[PDB]
Amino acid sequence: MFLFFFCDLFWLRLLLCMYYCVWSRLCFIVYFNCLMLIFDFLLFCLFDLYLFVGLCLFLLLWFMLFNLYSLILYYCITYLNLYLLFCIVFLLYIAFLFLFCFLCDFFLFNNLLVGDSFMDVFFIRFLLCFLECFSLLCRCLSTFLRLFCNLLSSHFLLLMFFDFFYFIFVFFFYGVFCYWFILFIFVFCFCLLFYVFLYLLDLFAAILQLFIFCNMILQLIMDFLLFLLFV
Amino acid sequence: VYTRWKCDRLPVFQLKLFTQEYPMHAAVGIFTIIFLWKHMSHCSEETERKYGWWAGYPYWRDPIARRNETKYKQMIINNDVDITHPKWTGCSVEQLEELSRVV
Amino acid sequence: SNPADHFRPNLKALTLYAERQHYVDRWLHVKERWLAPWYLPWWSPLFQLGTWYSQRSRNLFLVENHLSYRPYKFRRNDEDRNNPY
Amino acid sequence: STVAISVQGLHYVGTGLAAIALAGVGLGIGTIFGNLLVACARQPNLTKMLFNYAILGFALTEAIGLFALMLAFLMLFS
């Protein structure tokens, strides 16, 4: 089976071509922490710690073109599938993990054995090591699941509320002319307030979830970085 | 001065980017694509009927049946298949003629 | 249900079907055509890359002796849990 | 006599029970951020380290809640 379909970004691609044929400065970045990993001067890293910048920027752009514009009615999030997000997160997370593992430095994993020598190795330290090695994969899974489900839930709620608003607005507006107009006016004002609140909440959460999607990957990278001091 | 992004053409820059900038990511992507097309590239007829149609499966015309009919007719005509062979029917040609005369 | 139906791609254009046997055979023919010429010795890394892994996978499949039953991959109906056939 | 029964609707009740685990997740997240504000109020210059550890704690707590969601969706579609 081979299905032929198209993404819902064609108009946005056209706009990008129209508006970015000429250069323009970028100063506001959703995830700025990917550009400033080191805060104490004289610390430098021999590992390619700035390799994630390009992928971070492209992912932010793509996910913003999809999620933020999905608030507009009938706009489709073409990539909204659990296993597709799993594939994306797998690619990124496992690529960085294999970059660290291909380094063939086993000492890099010494920190996995949590704790100190004073704790039982077999019954305490080793169990915690197993749990943490499990927690890495759990972090990958959690990133992808959170990204999927936030969107799905928010859009379900928006659709339900819009259906209710359409129903009451269409089939109960005549009450404006009746003696119970005050009840309808109160309900309509409540619905408008809720509409505005939902839109603001979704706009903020769409950007926050991308902050956190990129932050998880950057945290994975940082968990294995070692900084040397200049002398 | 020379820079990959400004001087090289798009295919060359793409190859350089995915070979000397993000090679592990490209490798993992190819691995995942192969897995997807090896284990998630099939859909049974029942699955298509349940979920494969936007508004539902139009049983009143059964497009799947017509599709399979066209497929099998094309295969038979092109490959010169004798569908009356005993293996297809499980009985000899004379027995088939006897059955036709009976029914 | 109706709310759930709103999360589908909205620009589906065409669907093509192909049996695994047919396109696998076509790919094998292409690989044989490109790996046949004399100027590609069997001991070259390219030829081994092309052939060895496929041979190993097929051999693993042939040697398989499973006590359980694996239903046909391309049945007409696989949505029934109580009917592997 | 031996009787085997298969009810369709019991896959809904189990799903709702798993969602209750989210109650112990949402509260746990609120606890972390509640302590974050106090910690910032006490050592405001150290906001960055506190903020990062809060995100780490939030990440771990969310991971647990998702495992509940994994079961919730597995049963809902089963």
Binding site: M1, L3, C7, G54, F58, N81 | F13, L36, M40 | - | -
Partner: peptide
């Protein structure tokens, strides 16, 4: 729910793979 479906997952993921392998370089340059 299609978002939870897998009967055409490969074709669905081809969109992301095309974006990553073919559109990211253009956006990059």
């Amino acid at each position: 729910l299609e978002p939870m479906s897998t009967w055409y997952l490969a074709s669905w993921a081809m969109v992301w793979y095309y974006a990553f392998f073919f559109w990211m370089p253009m956006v990059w340059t």
